[PDB]
Amino acid sequence: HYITYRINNYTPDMNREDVDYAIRKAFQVWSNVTPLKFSKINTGMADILVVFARGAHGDDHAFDGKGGILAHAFGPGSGIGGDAHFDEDEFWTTHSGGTNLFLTAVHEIGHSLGLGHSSDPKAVMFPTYKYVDINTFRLSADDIRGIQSLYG
Ligand SMILES: [Co+2]
């Protein structure tokens, strides 16, 4: 099978350069341990979507503001399957600031691939908001094998 991604979201209080690499790296930190492939399409979204919205987007799944669900992407599949949801009213920040655009992008992208919602406590896959140094920003814990093997 073939895989494809497409990003198109830019929130305030954060340079477009941070978000660009934030998500762009999310595909690497994940693909680092996955049989999947790589296909950066310039035009033509695919099973994997990425868009930021504020609460109820007319016909979407509203979440909340700063504090609640900063971003939660449902499992993969058709259409919605593999869609990213980033709270607009939220407060995005660098790898140091609270809402880690990088780490978050990896957590949301994971749920829209084949991740549960916990795996391990130390792992960065846990359902929580934490900021880690981009220098060491990378997959860890046993989860690293739960993505490459994909069993349960
Ligand atoms: Co989550």
Tokens matching residue 120? 């391990």
Which residue, among 144, 132, 114, has the nearest Cα to 22 in the 3D structure? 132
Compute the distance between CA of residue 73 and CA of residue 85 in angstroms, rounded to an integer: 6
Count of CB atoms within 10 A of residue 140's CB?
15
Tokens matching residue 40? 């950066």
Tell me the CA–centroid distance for residue 43 and ligand 1, in Å: 28
After what residue numbers is the chain broken, C–N > 2.5 angstroms? none
* Buried residues in 70-79 as b, exposed as e (16+ CB within 10 A): bbbbeebeee
Which residue, among 106, 123, 124, 115, has the nearest Cα to 50 in the 3D structure? 106
Q: Name the structure determination technique.
A: NMR
Which residue, among 17, 23, 34, 86, has the nearest Cα to 57 in the 3D structure? 86
Compute the distance between CA of residue 62 and CA of residue 49 in angstroms, rounded to an integer: 17
Residue 64 annotated as lining a ligand binding site: yes
Contacts of 50 (CB under 8 A, 6+ apart): 5, 6, 7, 8, 9, 23, 83, 84, 86
Which residue, among 1, 22, 11, has the nearest Cα to 109 in the 3D structure? 22
Tell me the CA–centroid distance for residue 127 and ligand 1, in Å: 4
Count of CB atoms within 10 A of residue 99's CB?
22
Tokens matching residue 5? 């991604």
Contacts of 94 (CB under 8 A, 6+ apart): 14, 18, 100, 101, 134
Q: Which residues pair with 85 in a beta bridge?
A: 51
Tell me the domains of the chain and their CATH numbers: 1-152 (3.40.390.10)
Residue 88 annotated as lining a ligand binding site: yes
Residue 1 annotated as lining a ligand binding site: no
CB-CB contact of 94 with 104 (8 Å): no
Tell me the CA–centroid distance for residue 151 and ligand 1, in Å: 19
**Of how many residues is the chain composed?**
152
17 is catalytic: no
Contacts of 136 (CB under 8 A, 6+ apart): none
- 53 phi, psi to nearest 5 deg: -140, 170
Tell me the CA–centroid distance for residue 118 and ligand 1, in Å: 8
Tokens matching residue 80? 């919605």
Q: How far is CA 131 from CA 19, 45, 46, 115, in A?
A: 15, 29, 29, 20
Residue 83 annotated as lining a ligand binding site: yes
Tokens matching residue 57? 């987007």
Q: Catalytic residue among 6, 23, 49, 108, which?
A: 108
